[PDB]
């Protein structure tokens, strides 16, 4: 099941500016940073708040580490901006199993590595109204 | 303070056919529907989750009621997808003056009407890296 709202994804230029526009503007502080060679980003976690299913909610700001990347292409077309939203689910595996077999097109086989040690896939925008949509599962099990 | 996600507003052509989408790939159902004439939107509210401030977070669909309005404008240009974050306070005119005083523009000299009584501003996307940003207080007081 989706059970929260896990985060945000916000592509950006510069992303230590981005950080500090966030910090000054709102409070809000670096949960966690990191770089996905992978996922081509470098990205910031800032913690909103906690959830009733024993998760959090977070704003996960993102730059590109190359212009060959979904983030890089995504900017270099559109600007800054929203570019994804994430669900958390308790076990992505079979929520993805089940969204692949509505026809919603899941981006990878299997769940890939995402922000602190977490389980993720992609659902294609185009068969979600036109929302970048991520499904994740925690590393650490949650306590509702 | 700002103390959690409040939602994610979502631009769609049609809100019955989006809202199904919902609710049929993930099993999310509808909290709340209305029409804010001056907003010029249909929404739909759909909870995810509570959060540890008291409140909660939605998936907030909105289909305008007519060509010339924020998000009339906005789809014409972008298509569907996400058109706004915003962030739940208990105190939304008190953070509202504290955001003006650091020089991002604040969209209204006082909040307005949103969704279920609950009263909004917005600070202009030029302002916020590209994303438009709304600063919600619900009409009903939280406990944490
Ligand atoms: C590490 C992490 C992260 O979140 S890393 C986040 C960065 N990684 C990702 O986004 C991976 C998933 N995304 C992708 O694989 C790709 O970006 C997509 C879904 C396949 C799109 O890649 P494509 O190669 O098709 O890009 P392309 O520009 O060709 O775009 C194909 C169509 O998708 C639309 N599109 C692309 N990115 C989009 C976005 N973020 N939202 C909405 N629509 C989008 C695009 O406008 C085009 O529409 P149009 O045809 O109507 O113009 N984490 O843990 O949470
Ligand atoms: C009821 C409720 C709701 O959420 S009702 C949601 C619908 N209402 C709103 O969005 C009201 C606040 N928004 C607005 O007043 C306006 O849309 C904005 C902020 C003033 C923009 O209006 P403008 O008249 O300037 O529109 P305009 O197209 O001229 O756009 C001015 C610049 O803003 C950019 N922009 C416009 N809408 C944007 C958006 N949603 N996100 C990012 N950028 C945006 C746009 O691309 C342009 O950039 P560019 O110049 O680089 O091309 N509720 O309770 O929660
Ligand atoms: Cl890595
Ligand atoms: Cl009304
Ligand atoms: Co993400
Ligand atoms: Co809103």
């Not at 510069?14 to 992978?38: I, K, M, Q, S, W």
């Amino acid at each position: 099941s989706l059970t929260r709202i896990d985060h945000i994804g916000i592509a950006c230029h510069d992303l230590d500016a981005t950080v500090e526009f966030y910090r000054a503007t709102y409070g809000f502080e670096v949960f966690h940073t990191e770089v996905n060679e992978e996922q081509g980003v470098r990205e910031a976690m800032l913690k909103i708040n906690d959830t009733s299913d024993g998760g959090a909610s977070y704003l996960q700001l993102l730059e590109p580490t190359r212009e060959d990347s979904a983030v890089g292409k995504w900017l270099a077309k559109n600007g800054e901006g929203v570019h994804h939203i994430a669900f958390g689910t308790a076990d992505v595996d079979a929520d993805a199993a089940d969204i692949r077999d509505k026809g919603v097109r899941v981006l990878y086989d299997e769940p890939r590595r995402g922000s602190m040690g977490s389980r993720i896939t992609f659902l294609h925008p185009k068969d979600c109204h036109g929302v970048l949509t991520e499904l994740v599962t925690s590393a650490a099990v949650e306590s509702p």
